[PDB]
Ligand binder design. Structure first.
Ligand SMILES: Cn1nc([C@@H]2O[C@H](CO)[C@H](O)[C@H](n3cc(-c4ccc(Br)c(F)c4F)nn3)[C@H]2O)n(-c2cc(Cl)ccc2C(F)(F)F)c1=S
Ligand SMILES: [Mg+2]
Length: 138
């Protein structure tokens, strides 16, 4: 039981084989969730499940550089459900972030931001109740 928006410091940034686990419960009638892996003001990886974009559920991923959003990467496979407990796992790999939700693989997002050791904050926000936010090395 933690407050949303929540900031999780990633001391010294991220590194391959670093696994970030976020546990929580989606609120009933949710509109959006966002995970923002930040390098200062830039967003190295924005993971954004949208429950109602043109009456469809979509996961939108992007990068924000110098306050400009890049080319979006979209995924129609949508494992979240309003009112349900979830687990999101972000596994930092050499060339991409690998995302798995509720122990099932979801997507990969290739690194556009290369200074991994400077992505030192994960912002967690949106239509959820947050239970815990932590990391370990596998
Ligand atoms: C309908 N739409 N939405 C976007 C932006 O698309 C981005 C990904 O490409 C981010 O999702 C961004 N966004 C979302 C939030 C956000 C906040 C609060 C919570 Br709580 C939370 F969950 C959150 F997602 N803050 N910024 C969002 O505003 N764009 C978009 C897309 C691109 Cl490529 C470039 C520019 C834009 C923009 F200028 F129009 F914004 C459109 S078009
Ligand atoms: Mg339902």
């Amino acid at each position: 039981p933690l407050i949303v928006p929540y900031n999780l410091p990633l001391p010294g940034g991220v590194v391959p084989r670093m696994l970030i686990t976020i546990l929580g419960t989606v609120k009933p009638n949710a509109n959006r969730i966002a995970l923002d892996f930040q390098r200062g003001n830039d967003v190295a990886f924005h993971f954004n499940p949208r429950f109602n974009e043109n009456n469809r559920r979509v996961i939108v991923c992007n990068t924000k550089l110098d306050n400009n959003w890049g080319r979006e990467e979209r995924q129609s496979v949508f494992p979240f459900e309003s009112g349900k407990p979830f687990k999101i796992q972000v596994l930092v790999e050499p060339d991409h972030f690998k995302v798995a939700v509720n122990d099932a693989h979801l997507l990969q997002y290739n690194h556009r931001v290369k200074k991994l050791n400077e992505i030192s904050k994960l912002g967690i926000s949106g239509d959820i109740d947050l239970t815990s936010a932590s990391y370990t090395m596998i």
